[PDB]
Design an enzyme around this catalytic site. Structure first.
Site, PDB file in Angstrom:
ATOM      1  N   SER A  98       0.961  -1.322   0.396  1.00  0.00           N
ATOM      2  CA  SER A  98      -0.320   0.065   0.461  1.00  0.00           C
ATOM      3  C   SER A  98       0.541   1.487   0.375  1.00  0.00           C
ATOM      4  O   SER A  98       1.214   1.197  -1.118  1.00  0.00           O
ATOM      5  CB  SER A  98      -1.018  -0.165   1.378  1.00  0.00           C
ATOM      6  OG  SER A  98      -2.516   0.052   0.473  1.00  0.00           O
ATOM      7  N   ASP A 238      -4.102   5.544  -3.702  1.00  0.00           N
ATOM      8  CA  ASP A 238      -3.198   4.652  -3.369  1.00  0.00           C
ATOM      9  C   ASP A 238      -2.488   3.466  -4.520  1.00  0.00           C
ATOM     10  O   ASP A 238      -2.952   3.130  -6.086  1.00  0.00           O
ATOM     11  CB  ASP A 238      -3.526   4.400  -2.138  1.00  0.00           C
ATOM     12  CG  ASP A 238      -4.162   3.221  -2.228  1.00  0.00           C
ATOM     13  OD1 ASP A 238      -4.738   2.472  -3.644  1.00  0.00           O
ATOM     14  OD2 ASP A 238      -4.173   2.734  -0.966  1.00  0.00           O
ATOM     15  N   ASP A 240      -1.991   0.085  -4.617  1.00  0.00           N
ATOM     16  CA  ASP A 240      -2.899  -0.496  -5.096  1.00  0.00           C
ATOM     17  C   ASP A 240      -3.874   0.203  -5.922  1.00  0.00           C
ATOM     18  O   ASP A 240      -4.965  -1.223  -5.637  1.00  0.00           O
ATOM     19  CB  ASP A 240      -3.197  -1.776  -3.761  1.00  0.00           C
ATOM     20  CG  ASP A 240      -3.382  -1.416  -2.512  1.00  0.00           C
ATOM     21  OD1 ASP A 240      -3.455   0.006  -2.075  1.00  0.00           O
ATOM     22  OD2 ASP A 240      -3.720  -2.028  -2.020  1.00  0.00           O
ATOM     23  N   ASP A 242      -7.344   0.273  -4.382  1.00  0.00           N
ATOM     24  CA  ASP A 242      -8.252   0.508  -4.123  1.00  0.00           C
ATOM     25  C   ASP A 242      -8.882   1.410  -3.013  1.00  0.00           C
ATOM     26  O   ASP A 242     -10.109   1.641  -2.618  1.00  0.00           O
ATOM     27  CB  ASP A 242      -7.988  -1.345  -2.783  1.00  0.00           C
ATOM     28  CG  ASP A 242      -7.064  -0.831  -1.672  1.00  0.00           C
ATOM     29  OD1 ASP A 242      -6.515   0.433  -1.920  1.00  0.00           O
ATOM     30  OD2 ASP A 242      -7.186  -1.233  -0.918  1.00  0.00           O
TER      31      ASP A 242
HETATM   32 MG   LIG Z   1      -4.648   0.309  -0.784  1.00  0.00          MG
END
Ligand SMILES: [Mg+2]
Ligand SMILES: O=P(O)(O)O[C@H]1O[C@H](CO)[C@@H](O)[C@H](O)[C@H]1O
Length: 449
Positions: A98, A238, A240, A242
């Protein structure tokens, strides 16, 4: 250290190689196989330099334990969620760091239907198995299949909007050299939007900083691009992706709170009368916008695992947290950083109103402090000081998630974080900016005292 530090409440999270490494990754694969129902396991990874090696070790442990592996390759966290559910796999693991430092990495684990595996639902069971496992590595007894086809995922994303109603909006997109750009580019041929691409190429060396749009210096990069290019609005993610973050045409970042109510209304237009799950940190605006759109608001403890299980039990169409997480029923009850901006773009296109105008009156009607975090010597004593001070006002108290106190024209939520050793504070008022500031400063002083 008595137990492995990398194992947190919601996921695995630690410095490489002392807290997380290929050996631990392989043991985690072995332990995970013992925790799942029947089926293959989906594996994906983010742009971090060490993520492929960690995924390969994970695959080795899984296949040594007789688990077929479906490698969906470089991806976003939501793709592991989607493919796990879509392919009816036994579970999935996303290898991602992350927004942790460069020497960090981690894993997010799910079982059937991308149901979360958290500390109290299998993750600490995995930890304890890994902790005691001194067995020699066995050899693979199952195969790995490469499945990089994103067609089903992309079609699912696009299904949330009527493409014939979309206008050629000019949108700034900022992947922060994370992975979001790949999906934007795959969607673009099927959309009329004009994209302004910022920090667009995936680069695990992160030459422009680790993806975190909440940091002011990172925030300003998207803001500047919007203003300089006269974009309708801007989106940042961010690493990744999500989590998504919105900037209106003035470059102003929109507090995540207000997107819950906005996205709820967007979804309710498509699925009338549906239930909407929200967290207890900031509530008034969401409850009002959901109800006005004919939906039913459902209060739930903050935290993605709580949100998802509440949505499932309620058949909720949508769930949203102020912390930039947005969950969608048909998307395996999972969060997506892609669905929200598609919905917003459609909203702007159809209504003829700017993103600014869509939220402006709401922000005036229910101004909020923003989440304010406190690291104090004694959290429990600090919370006590706050509650003792406001006792004589006799607020309405709720203990769904820490302490919520409703004073009538203002309210606050005060929470211990489950992911960090912090106290989190959120305040909102009924259209009173002055009350907001004085009460926020008052609580702040009490907590620090
Ligand atoms: Mg994330
Ligand atoms: O540390 P917290 O506040 O307990 O939990 C935080 O991380 C979780 C997972 O990213 C989110 O679901 C929460 O909304 C967020 O507040």
């Amino acid at each position: 250290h008595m137990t492995l530090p990398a194992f947190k409440a919601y996921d695995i999270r630690g410095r490489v190689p002392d807290e997380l490494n290929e050996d631990l990754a392989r043991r985690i694969g072995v332990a995970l196989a013992a925790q799942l129902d029947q089926g293959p396991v989906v594996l994906g990874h983010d742009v971090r330099l060490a993520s492929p090696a960690l995924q390969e070790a994970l695959s080795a442990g899984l296949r040594a334990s007789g688990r077929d592996v479906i490698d969906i390759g470089l991806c976003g966290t939501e793709e592991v969620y989607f493919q796990t559910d879509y392919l009816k796999a036994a579970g999935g693991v996303m290898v991602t760091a992350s927004h942790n430092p460069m020497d960090y990495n981690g894993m997010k684990l799910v079982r059937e239907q991308a149901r979360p595996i958290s500390s109290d639902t299998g993750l600490f069971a995995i930890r304890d198995t890994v902790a005691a496992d001194t067995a020699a590595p066995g050899e693979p007894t199952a195969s790995e299949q490469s499945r990089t086809d994103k067609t089903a995922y992309l079609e699912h994303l696009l299904s949330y909007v009527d493409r014939s109603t979309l206008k050629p909006l000019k949108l700034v997109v900022n992947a922060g050299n994370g992975g979001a750009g790949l999906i934007v580019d795959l969607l673009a041929p099927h959309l009329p939007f004009e994209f302004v691409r910022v920090f667009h190429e995936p680069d695990g060396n992160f030459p422009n900083g680790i993806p975190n749009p909440l940091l002011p210096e990172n925030r300003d990069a998207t803001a500047k691009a919007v203003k300089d290019n006269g974009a309708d609005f801007g989106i940042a993610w961010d690493g990744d992706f999500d989590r998504c973050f919105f900037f209106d045409h003035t470059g102003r970042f929109i507090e995540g709170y207000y997107l819950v109510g906005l996205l709820a209304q967007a979804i309710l237009a498509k699925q009338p009368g549906g239930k909407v799950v929200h967290d207890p940190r900031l509530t008034w605006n969401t409850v009002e916008q959901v109800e006005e759109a004919g939906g039913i608001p459902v209060l739930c403890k903050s935290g993605h695992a709580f949100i998802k299980e509440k949505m499932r039990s309620e058949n909720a169409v949508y769930g949203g947290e102020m912390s930039a997480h947005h969950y969608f029923r048909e998307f395996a009850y999972a969060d997506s950083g892609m669905i929200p901006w598609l919905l917003i773009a459609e909203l702007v296109s159809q209504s003829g109103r700017s993103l600014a105008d869509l939220v402006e009156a709401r922000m005036q009607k229910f101004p909020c402090s923003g989440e304010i975090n406190f690291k104090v010597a004694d959290a429990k004593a600090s919370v006590a000081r706050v509650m003792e001070h406001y006792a004589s006002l006799s607020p309405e108290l709720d203990y769904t998630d820490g302490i919520s106190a409703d004073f009538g024209q203002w309210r606050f939520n005060l929470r211990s974080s489950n992911t960090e050793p912090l106290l989190r504070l959120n305040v909102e008022t009924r259209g009173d900016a002055a009350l907001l500031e004085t009460r926020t400063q008052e609580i702040s002083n009490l907590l620090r005292g």
